[PDB]
Design a protein around this ligand. Structure first.
Ligand SMILES: *[C@@H]1O[C@H](CO[C@@H]2O[C@@H](C)[C@@H](O)[C@@H](O)[C@@H]2O)[C@@H](O[C@@H]2O[C@H](CO)[C@@H](O[C@@H]3O[C@H](CO[C@H]4O[C@H](CO)[C@@H](O)[C@H](O)[C@@H]4O[C@@H]4O[C@H](CO)[C@@H](O[C@@H]5O[C@H](CO)[C@H](O)[C@H](O)[C@H]5O)[C@H](O)[C@H]4NC(C)=O)[C@@H](O)[C@H](O[C@H]4O[C@H](CO)[C@@H](O)[C@H](O)[C@@H]4O[C@@H]4O[C@H](CO)[C@@H](O)[C@H](O)[C@H]4NC(C)=O)[C@@H]3O)[C@H](O)[C@H]2NC(C)=O)[C@H](O)[C@H]1NC(C)=O
Ligand SMILES: *[C@@H]1O[C@H](CO[C@@H]2O[C@@H](C)[C@@H](O)[C@@H](O)[C@@H]2O)[C@@H](O[C@@H]2O[C@H](CO)[C@@H](O[C@@H]3O[C@H](CO[C@H]4O[C@H](CO)[C@@H](O)[C@H](O)[C@@H]4O)[C@@H](O)[C@H](O[C@H]4O[C@H](CO)[C@@H](O)[C@H](O)[C@@H]4O[C@@H]4O[C@H](CO)[C@@H](O[C@@H]5O[C@H](CO)[C@H](O)[C@H](O)[C@H]5O)[C@H](O)[C@H]4NC(C)=O)[C@@H]3O)[C@H](O)[C@H]2NC(C)=O)[C@H](O)[C@H]1NC(C)=O
Lengths: 260, 205, 98, 209, 268, 99
């Protein structure tokens, strides 16, 4: 499981929207929310109900907010900018793998080099931002501590204290329906509703034989659970020969889903 | 009817803030059929992110279709093919543009002062040399004390003896300005440079 | 770069007429982050609509979930209307109950 | 298929040296196989001339021939901007095709030649680059060569003429000599031939100071 | 015509055909050749009537001395060019005396049939607009007293020599009238060609005109050339309508004739 | 640079059958100076032919006069044959008595 922070700063935010905001994730569940308007890191979902930990996260995110907003001054341009950062960590023998990547206007352009302890990239914008960040007192030092020690220590703390939240399981409610589509064809849709870990496999069978997986879509629900649907094109009048099988951690055995 | 596919600007591909775009121009389009269909393909995969300008009318309707590309996709030599389609064309015309294949070479930048013979004239010429680069797509600019200079003309890239390219930038400054000790820098940008950017300073010794 | 949004419309639980449920509009894969989303009930904009935090995927493209509590009926039609810089006109995606 | 005509002007070095022969070359491509005969009519300022030497119709790999007609011109006639028109005539061509080549109109400008030594940064490398600058000339037709101790150098590449801010042209010649050869104090000269400079020839010397 | 010129026509070739001279000169007093010189014989000699004219003691030896030094210069010019290919160097040196004392010098040179160098009398140096002029002029400038002798030859020696020959002028005042003939040829179906020919005349200045019924009918297409004795030949032809030839006449004006001469077809 | 020769053929005095005269072949306006000239009597090359000095005109082009003593007759035909670098084949110009 990975602990990852999704940081974003915009040079010209839309009225009433924050210039900087963060979302923290523990695997597929969001545990943290932060924005420059409120200025405080807050828990999300189940983590609201789970010490002097949130004040420290607030202190650190306010420091990253200043770094992000300072990056736009280093670029110095009238046009709008969007700066994104993905910082976090994930281990065979209690090891940690850091992640420290950045994107400008939707394109990856910078990373934090843990060997040199500096921000680097192959672009002039990376050179400009890295230089400005290197001259901020203890910024490189705090960035190294955050990835190499603070992140794995926080990740281990959340795995120990919030184990139950991370081991959440809910099987999907299934439905299989057909629609007319092309003249000599129909479209069968197998849909999975409100399921807890997002890992799910939907397969189609024709007379019990493998018929592949069609074109699918995936998305979340308001409670952090998920929704998925896969559709397959079949010959008109042959729909009754098809079945849909779902495999999910909430189910003990694969489930066969029948058509109406 | 004829089709011409242009590659993006070199400065646009070296700066993420800039937008690099592959321009497809369609000339000789008949007035009998003004509709021109455009199909964009990156490595065979069709893309719908292209923005097509209206058919501006010569009998040739200049129907232009531009496509914004990823900086890392163009630098990794991805092939961008545009397929045009019209009733006047018996077969659909297709053009393909890609980054110049070959291992990139880090250019060396050397600033040269004006000759002792030229110091007679009212305007001296500050020379700059960019040697050994690949591909030929490069961008060279001049600046003095933060404020950039406008009186510079840069020679096109010329093929060198070792298979690489060389280039020269000639900035024409006033003799009095050079004698005052002003520091003139030449900023050069290329795919094979560290951070795509480098600038060498030049002033009186 | 600018990336056009992908729009998905689905209910939280299997739809059953007369039963309380949630209608979702999941908008993903767009850039820049500025976006306008509205949920429609028979063409009329729904007032009580909440949304998740604006987050982003591995490819840096943004995603957002809009949702509202609703009770579907046989005659009621629902849709999601999205506007973005990449869209010439607002894209309307009707809710397909299947 | 439509036959095409291309009229080429003489070489710049050929027009500056009397010993050399300057020639206006007329190349006729896309000539039909049905009719291989190609009539050539040369006119200098409207007056028909007959001192042209037409090369034979050589068959190309395309099923067309390359009928070339060359005319040797006077050095003082070409330098005074005389108009040379070439009228091609064949049964395949409905109307006789006509091309006209003349010296680039405009008052000639005497180019200034400045030799620049290699930068201190480059003195690290095994091979240094001796730069030469030819600025303020007109027309673009020029010839630049390098030589050392009488024997000419072959490791030079000269940039094409670039249009300058003042309406004139500029050019650069880059000779790549070995670092050891430059350090030995060898004198490298850049010779440049152009219409507007005295005696059509000038050479600036360059060595270690 | 009150201006007569003394002109030397010098030629040097880098690869002369076997048995032919590498350098040769012809000297002219107006339209008559008075001098001949070639590198094979190595001596300046009189030509035509000038062979029989009694000249000052040492005249021809001095001309030989001067032409031998020019022979060395012209051959030196090829060494300055330094090329395997063949060269032809020509020079036209002399002066022309007008009605007054004003002598006008001529000093021009050509390489491979194209004019390129001249001797600049203001600077006292050979100059031009070509790299071959720079090369040759420099080599000639380094030859002891070559420029000094060239300048004195044009400004002092030439007018003095010319004035002496004009004073000592029986050969130059030769006037031989042309023998005339007018004949017609058939030509195009409805046309004929009339040719008026002038034989063995001197001086070369001659005017041939056609008249139709006594009215001016112009001058047709003509040709001119010399005879072996230094006299000249000329012929002009005019296209006329077939059957109309008998209406034409030809008039000749020449210094050997006191009045213009009418020439009839006389086809008889 | 290279100029093709102009050839003129005429007698020194008006032609009269049985009377001694000179036949001239005047070659002018050529470059380079190397040239070959022959006088012909009924197609046969004439042996006793003299020539003037090779000289040149204001345009630097060369000129030369070839001549031979002859006695014209009614049946005798004369011509001049010239060869030069500029000529693909020797040019033969027949003597026109009227000119
Ligand atoms: C079938 O094939 C033949 C080709 O033959 C063979 O084909 C294949 C199968 C192979 O085997 C191949 O190896 C063979 O060669 C086709 O013929 C070709 O036709 C095209 C036209 O479609 C010609 O293209 C034009 O070329 C011009 C430049 O030509 C020079 O450079 C190329 C190389 O880049 C050479 O190939 C050429 O020979 C030219 O090179 C010059 O040659 C001169 C002598 O010929 C040299 O000068 C003389 O040299 C001697 C000796 O040294 C003396 O010194 C003399 O004193 C000296 O003068 C010269 O040094 C040498 N230079 C160089 C660098 O090599 C282009 O300029 C031209 O562009 C015009 O046309 C375009 C198309 O229309 C247009 O888009 C352009 O904008 C441009 O337009 C012109 O613009 C100007 C300014 O506005 C106007 O004034 C013009 O009017 C205007 N023109 C037009 C028409 O609009 C062309 O690109 C091609 O060159 C020719 N090949 C050859 C060998 O000649 C044939 O067409 C095929 N048949 C069919 C049916 O398909
Ligand atoms: C009506 O009028 C317009 C123009 O008139 C204008 O408007 C009027 C109203 C007036 O104001 C007037 O003054 C204006 O000019 C006319 O349209 C023109 O058509 C031309 C067609 O030849 C076209 O010319 C091309 O120009 C290219 C340069 O582009 C510059 O200009 C444009 C302008 O819009 C700019 O955007 C651009 O930034 C540039 O500044 C030039 O490059 C083209 O050359 C190629 O084609 C020539 C033959 O036509 C040929 O001779 C050249 O050598 C060259 O050939 C190409 O070579 C390369 C390399 O070998 C090949 O590429 C390789 O291909 C492989 C395989 O696919 C691989 O991909 C490699 O990577 C790749 O490098 C290429 O395939 C070769 N092509 C061919 C065909 O062989 C060309 O000269 C003009 O730009 C047009 N004008 C405009 C404004 O766009 C209409 O045609 C007129 N209508 C009628 C009915 O006449």
């Amino acid at each position: 499981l990975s602990l990852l922070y999704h940081l974003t700063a915009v040079s010209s935010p839309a009225p009433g929207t924050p210039a900087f905001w963060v979302s923290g994730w523990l695997g597929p569940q969001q545990y943290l929310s932060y924005n420059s308007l409120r200025g405080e890191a807050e828990p999300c979902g189940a983590w609201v109900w789970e010490s002097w930990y949130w004040e420290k996260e607030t202190t650190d995110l306010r420091i990253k907010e200043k770094l992000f907003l300072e990056a736009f001054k280093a670029l110095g341009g009238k046009g709008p900018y969007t700066l994104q950062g993905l910082l976090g960590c994930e281990g065979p023998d209690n090891t940690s793998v850091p992640t420290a990547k950045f994107a400008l206007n939707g394109e990856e352009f910078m990373n934090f080099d843990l060997k040199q302890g500096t921000w680097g990239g192959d672009w002039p914008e990376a050179l400009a931002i890295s230089q400005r960040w290197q001259q901020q007192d203890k910024a490189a030092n705090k960035e190294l501590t955050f990835l190499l020690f603070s992140c794995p220590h926080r990740l281990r703390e959340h795995l120990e204290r919030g184990r139950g939240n991370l081991e959440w399981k809910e099987p999907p409610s299934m439905r299989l329906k057909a629609r007319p589509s092309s003249p000599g064809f129909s479209v069968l849709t197998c849909s999975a509703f409100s399921f807890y870990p997002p890992e799910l496999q939907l397969r189609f069978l024709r007379n019990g034989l493998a018929a592949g997986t069609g074109q699918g879509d995936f998305g979340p629900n308001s409670d952090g659970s998920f929704h998925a649907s896969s559709s397959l094109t079949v010959k008109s009048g042959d729909e009754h020969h098809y079945c849909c099988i779902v495999q999910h951690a909430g189910l003990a055995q694969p489930l066969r889903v029948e058509l109406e | 009817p004829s089709v011409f596919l242009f590659p993006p600007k070199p400065k646009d591909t070296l700066y993420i803030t800039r937008e690099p775009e592959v321009t497809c121009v369609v000339v000789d389009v008949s007035h009998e059929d003004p509709e021109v269909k455009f199909n964009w393909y990156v490595d065979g995969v069709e893309v719908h992110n292209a923005k097509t300008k209206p058919r501006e009318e010569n009998s040739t309707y200049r129907v232009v279709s531009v496509l914004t590309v990823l900086h890392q996709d163009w630098l990794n030599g991805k092939e961008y093919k545009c397929k045009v389609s019209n009733k006047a064309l018996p077969a659909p015309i297709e053009k393909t543009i890609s980054k110049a294949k070959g291992q990139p070479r880090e250019p060396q930048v050397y600033t040269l002062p004006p000759s002792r013979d030229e110091l007679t004239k009212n305007q001296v010429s500050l020379t700059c040399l960019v040697k050994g680069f690949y591909p030929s797509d490069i961008a060279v600019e001049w600046e003095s004390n933060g404020q950039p200079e406008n009186n510079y003309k840069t020679t096109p890239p010329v093929l060198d003896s070792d298979g690489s390219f060389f280039l020269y930038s000639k900035l024409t400054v006033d003799k009095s300005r050079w004698q005052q000790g002003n520091v003139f820098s030449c900023s050069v940008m290329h795919e094979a440079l560290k951070f795509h950017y480098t600038q060498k300073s030049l002033s009186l010794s | 770069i600018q990336r056009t949004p992908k729009i998905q419309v689905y209910s939280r639980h299997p739809a059953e007429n007369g039963k309380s449920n949630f209608l979702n509009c999941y908008v993903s894969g767009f850039h820049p982050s500025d976006i306008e989303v509205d949920l429609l009930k028979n063409g009329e904009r729904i007032e009580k609509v909440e949304h998740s935090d604006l987050s982003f995927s591995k490819d840096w493209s943004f995603y957002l979930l809009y949702y509202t509590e609703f009770t579907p009926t046989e005659k009621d039609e629902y849709a999601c209307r999205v506007n973005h810089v990449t869209l010439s006109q607002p894209k309307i995606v009707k809710w397909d109950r299947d």
